[model samples]
Target: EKQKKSVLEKALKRIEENFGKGSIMILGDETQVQPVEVIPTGSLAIDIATGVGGYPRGRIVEIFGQESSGKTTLALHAIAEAQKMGGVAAFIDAEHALDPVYAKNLGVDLKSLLISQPDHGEQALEIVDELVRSGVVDLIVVDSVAALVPRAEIEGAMGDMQVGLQARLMSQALRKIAGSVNKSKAVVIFTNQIRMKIGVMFGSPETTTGGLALKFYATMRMEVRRGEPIKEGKDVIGNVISVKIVKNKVAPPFKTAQTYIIYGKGIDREYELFNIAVNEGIVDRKGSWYYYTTLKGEEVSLGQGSSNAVQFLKDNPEIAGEIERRIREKYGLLSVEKEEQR
Candidate 1:
């Protein structure tokens, strides 16, 4: 954990020194929002007091687990619920792992939610700025951490270093961005894929692969562990997903706040896994681009292989215009003379 000093204060001081404290305060404050309500993400306790109070208005939520651990599925659940509450969401496929058809099936109307897929960490973050600027967006989610880091270093880049230092820094960036969003009053969620690390007693500890940045910047860190077999004598064959809270700042850190050992699913949802005939005649596979761009964590971006992030904001004149029009329309009553006095 980071030393609990005044990191927030230092950040604020830097901002005020340049912009003037008074001018910077105009960015708004969630701390003062009356009757601050927590949005339920289908997980009641998690919605209760995990991070900065329910999917905090401006921060990031990082969830990690191995394959088939319900990472993407749970993300879809959050997106569907957020929009069901009647607000727009920005689902940035940092890894391009989401399937449009799957998202649609889960009741996330793609139209109501803005979607972005950026090629790398830098571009992915640029999109975050754009989405938050929109003001009305209710939530943002970036995909897994595996793709966030630069490709593995060349033979000599690390030399004697074995640690994945770069991967961790990328995640830390997400944490800082989460803090920025909190300042802006937005919600962000990040997903990560776990990797093993050498632990004590000549064995590997079950640790996620992200750099220490994940441990530092994240307000809440949740782990999704794969469960063992259900019956005493039965060999472990089913995929049971476990959701564990590794660290939460404002809340208790090492408590089992929620226990979700993925054991079984709906009756109808089972049995279909073994049906070869059912999947055999499915003549249509997704397009080639789908595999390259979507399935493989490759997002579309600019010529430099970066997301055309800033331009997206500037080019979308209609959105910018509407925001300005709404501001003036709502606050047009403020007297020009009185405003100057403040």
Candidate 2:
């Protein structure tokens, strides 16, 4: 027994000495990789889809979709959540188009938020690397991958052949900063644009612009697609947004969430909660009437019709809290059951 113990200690010591201190760890050691932390995205549906209640730190997340698909809105909402948690956040606008008024309305703290608009792809990536190495910022958003133009492409003429340059740059830059991001435990969000393949006979032609490096590095990839339009009489008001978790490393992938986004007013929290409550059986629907059971074991009628039910929840904040609590407990128990089965 003494010989066996000595051999194990010697091996551990040799590894630490050769690779530097804190380089070796025994299995199940306290110093091993810690449990991942998450930042809430402010949308309950999205929060549930993440499985951990939010975006996981120490990993890269990719949000991709077509124009006006609410990608930036989601990123901004996350930043706002981080700020509310008293954490620092940064936004690198590679696209050079961020509406301050809109971001402010979304609850982002302009004073504390770090905004940078880089000139080229290399600069944007270098900024990301520097921020990750600094270890101060809790969240960093690069908006987005499609707009990051390499210096060569920016300076060359329109006729110049620049195929694969952006991809190569992305490959190298992401490889260099992946470790730093993990070490810093910073959540990096990269928004990407979708492109369609021409003349495709079969299969989905939707593809993102950042090559495969982002796809490989991303721990989670969410695709935001526009759904049915919300109309006010003859005029179009807003549309329902569907967020699909295409890839998730912290939890099961392919989970989806549907929420409404009203123009100029961000996501409708009450409306979403009402829909979830009904769907999850927390709110009972008896024909046209809506009802919910109180914690005191009493059934109470909310109102008639969906709009009235949503308004009731809005008017009574206490009931809304109760509904949210129940929904969370339901999801929490679900995950626990899944774990036991595993």
Candidate 3:
């Protein structure tokens, strides 16, 4: 960058014909270098645009939220979606927080998803090393940083030191894994808990230290902040989860409205009433109702869906049947009676 022009600038001039200074894009959309594969998430126009495809493949996405922020549900759903696309998903559990029951409720298959719960934080991160060694998991996610305290964060002020060190270590580990995932063309995701900064400008500024660490370490990062009480007396008002682009590897950052998570149940892609409801008085381009939900019925966070689903549904009719079969084989489908009642 300091010498001559950056590779991108040179690429623009030679390949894109001065793409930087003009309305020039690749003519044939061909690339001299290897192409970077992007996974399109399946929610809707709003979600597909927000997350760049929920939890994009071949990238590290850091998720930070407090309890009930829909972190696990979102993570598990991504795993299911990845496998549904014939990709593998992996989980690096630091505190033994990977619960199959909860995962099942989210429509994720643990069998297809690899998991390694390190005995401790330091040990849990070693999974990154194992990920390189094992070399099969397409998507790897770390449950939480509440336990996997980083070594650098061990010295002074146990709190700040711990947060900072974990952030740095986690960031470094992610960088290494990101290289492997990008090479293997896979996805890696991490989750963290929120902590209220004690002395943050006299205000109880809350944040996730793991997120700070991930923000510096990851190619793509998203923060899921829960909505405030809907009414003066209501504590939990139909959870709202927002997905914002904190970082992007090949593009610029952007923002999207909060989304709802659909767990266990099949998503009704054509539903509209639930669509505009989540994004807060917005409408889709065709003036039709839009909606985004996990197959599981849970609150939504970091909303994004793949672009392939719509096409998949159009070309492959058996896809849903296969998913349904898997669902029944794994966790007996709710009785017609149970589904109706629920």
Candidate 4:
């Protein structure tokens, strides 16, 4: 009896060698490093699909698309949201197509934004590494990596054989930052372009450039494509864009959403919650009129119009919030705050 000890003694001795048996963070125990938090992209639909409720920091996100497919728009949305969360933003304009006035209209603060135009792909990577490792920039976006020319290719003649040059450069650059991206906790977004998948008989006919390196390194890969155009009389001014999450390491993959990007006003958040309520059976709809059960369990009638729906939600925060939560639950994306969801 005197030689035998209780559980406390064993735990103390075991902890000395293995750190804590159970702790918020592991010291000597076998465990993976914790991930940095995510920054919301300021869009309800986008947040709903993302595992982190938005764009996860310390990760690479690839957004590829054809012309006028909303790649730049989505990147700008994230940049603006990051700035609002008390962080600086940078835009590596390799395509030389950034419009200051247009960015301003999207709620971007021009004063705090860093706009750099690198001459080549090598220079672009160098700038990204410096900004990320220094930890001064919280968000950096490379607008369309397809436009960035490799240094070797730029120096050589136009007729020179440049096969695999961009791919090699991209692979090297991603490798250089792969080891430090987690520690830096900066959001790295690459806007890419898609080319025709020639000689293929099945599946998608388009493929992204920069080779397979970007796709391999990316924690999240998304495709932005133009949806049905919005028409008024004879003029076609605005249209809906479909954002599809093709791959995700943090959340469920292949989630999609549609949002409108007008010629003047940015993303119109009209009736998104109400639509969610309808899909969740919380709201009953018949033609243009919709019905919802309130937090007090009182049924109310309302028009399906965007303005009316938005005002009703503002007046009833609790009910509107519940509908939003239910929508997330429907997708099995309740919350990553708990370990199970993650």
CA lDDT, every model vs. true structure = 0.50, 0.79, 0.51, 0.71
Cα miss at 144, model 2 (Å)?
A: 1.0
lDDT for position 207 in model 3: 39
Query: Per-residue lDDT tens digits of candidate 3, residues 181-216?
Result: 655666677776665432243332243454455565
Which of candidates 2 and 4 is the stronger one according to TM-score?
Answer: 2
Over 256-318, each residue of candidate 2 has an lDDT whose tens digit, in order, gives 988877677567678779989998888999999999999888888899987789889989998
Runs in model 4 deviating more than 4 A are 1-36, 158-166, 195-209, 231-237, 282-287, 290-304, 311-342
Candidate 1 residue spans exceeding 4 A from truth: 1-36, 48-53, 151-176, 195-210, 228-240, 257-342
Model 3 residue 41 CA deviation in Å: 4.2
Off by over 4 Å in 3: 1-36, 40-42, 45-47, 95-99, 150-172, 196-213, 228-238, 262-342
Give stretches of model 2 more than 4 Å off.
1-35, 157-166, 195-209, 231-236, 286-288, 298-301, 333-342
Cα displacement (angstroms), candidate 3, residue 246, comes to: 2.2
Query: What is the Cα-based lDDT of residue 183 in candidate 1?
Result: 64
Candidate 1 lDDT, tens digit per residue, 1-342? Answer: 244436765676588687632223322232322223333354433443243224545555677777666666667766876788777777877565567776676567788888776666656765776677667777787775555544344223653566567555556555557556766656677777655322223323233344355555565677766554433235543444456666654444443333232223211111221111113321112332111122234443312211122233245544333332332223221112323131
What TM-score, computed on C-alpha atoms, does each candidate reach? 0.52, 0.77, 0.57, 0.73
Candidate with best lDDT: 2
Candidate 2 matches the true fold with a TM-score of 0.77
Task: Report the Cα lDDT for candidate 3.
Answer: 0.51
